[PDB]
Amino acid sequence: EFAKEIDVSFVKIEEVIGAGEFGEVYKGRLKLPGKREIYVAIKTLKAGYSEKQRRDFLSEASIMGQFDHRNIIRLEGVVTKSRPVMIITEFMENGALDSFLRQNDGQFTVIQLVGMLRGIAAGMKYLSEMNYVHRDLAARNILVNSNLVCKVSDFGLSRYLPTYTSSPVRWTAPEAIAYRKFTSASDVWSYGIVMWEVMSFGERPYWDMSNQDVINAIEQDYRLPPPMDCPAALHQLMLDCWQKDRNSRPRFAEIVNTLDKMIRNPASLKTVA
Ligand SMILES: O=C(CCl)Nc1ccc2c(Nc3cc(O)ccc3Cl)ncnc2c1
């Protein structure tokens, strides 16, 4: 049973706004009894789905429904007791962060980009302190609203932990590639990659290098260079997230504190590499 179960009559499905693993993402309208109608995004599961597909689809809604944070995509409702099965979230006008930035190259100031990163780190602090590992933290899995508020999304690979031993290569920590051992520290590595994506206006990490080239480079202690005009302190935070020893990486609480100090100390963001 889902606390956020909604009657199907409450949702009105409009245009397709994206694609998902199990089906399309649509823009829609949600009308809860005695409440003003809101715009929503709707994840659907294509007709003729297998029982495994349904279970996997809904496991995302189960993880999501456990979260209530500004920087974690809000679950507005789920449809499981009726057809079609749906996951209904708050509408994010600007979609995925990586493509939003590529389509808006040089549109935002360093402080605006830092504000976006602070929100992601706050969402990840909450997620990790709820004892979860995301395992798929990438700018493409971050959604952006009209006011540049960034929210962690795509909880399919998320796991309750403190290590998750498995049975997204250029975003994955080297120990997680080598041993299939995922922790909050391996999510911190992914976060460092997201920082690089944001300060690069959505450039692909490691550019045209193959997954194999990335694995080899990381093993040879290569680290991505600072993006154009990136403050030294922000690239240093990226390098801290990318320490070989996972225990040496900052925790998400520290990352938030660091970004909060930069936002308040303009001199800290006033020196390039
Ligand atoms: O408006 C645009 C133009 Cl790119 N795109 C989108 C695409 C997907 C969206 C989205 N997806 C989503 C993600 C999940 O992890 C679970 C459920 C859903 Cl519905 N949620 C909110 N807003 C969106 C906006």
From Swiss-Prot:
Phenotype for S99T: In an ovarian undifferentiated carcinoma sample; somatic mutation
PTM statement from Swiss-Prot or TrEMBL: Phosphorylated. Autophosphorylation is stimulated by the ligand EFNB1. Required for interaction with SH2 domain-containing interactors, for activation of the MAPK/ERK and JUN signaling cascades and for ubiquitination by CBL. Ubiquitinated; (EFNB1)ligand-induced poly- and/or multi-ubiquitination by CBL is regulated by SRC and leads to lysosomal degradation.
Effect noted on mutating Y164F: Loss of interaction with SHC1
Binding positions for ATP per the UniProt entry: I17, G18, A19, G20, E21, F22, G23, E24, V25, K43
Catalytic residues as annotated in Swiss-Prot or TrEMBL: D136 (proton acceptor)
Cell compartments where the protein resides: Cell membrane; Early endosome membrane; Cell projection, Dendrite
Tissue: Preferentially expressed in brain.
Cytoplasmic membrane side: 1-273
Protein kinase domain span: 11-263
Record's subunit section: Heterotetramer upon binding of the ligand. The heterotetramer is composed of an ephrin dimer and a receptor dimer. Oligomerization is probably required to induce biological responses. Interacts with EPHB6; transphosphorylates EPHB6 to form an active signaling complex. Interacts with PICK1. The ligand-activated form interacts (residues within the catalytic domain) with GRB2 (via SH2 domain).
Family membership: Belongs to the protein kinase superfamily. Tyr protein kinase family. Ephrin receptor subfamily.
Record function comment: Receptor tyrosine kinase which binds promiscuously transmembrane ephrin-B family ligands residing on adjacent cells, leading to contact-dependent bidirectional signaling into neighboring cells. The signaling pathway downstream of the receptor is referred to as forward signaling while the signaling pathway downstream of the ephrin ligand is referred to as reverse signaling. Cognate/functional ephrin ligands for this receptor include EFNB1, EFNB2 and EFNB3.
Protein name as catalogued: Ephrin type-B receptor 1
Organism: Homo sapiens (Human)
Phylogenetic lineage: Eukaryota, Metazoa, Chordata, Craniata, Vertebrata
Gene behind the chain: EPHB1
Stretch of the intact protein here: 609 to 892 of 984
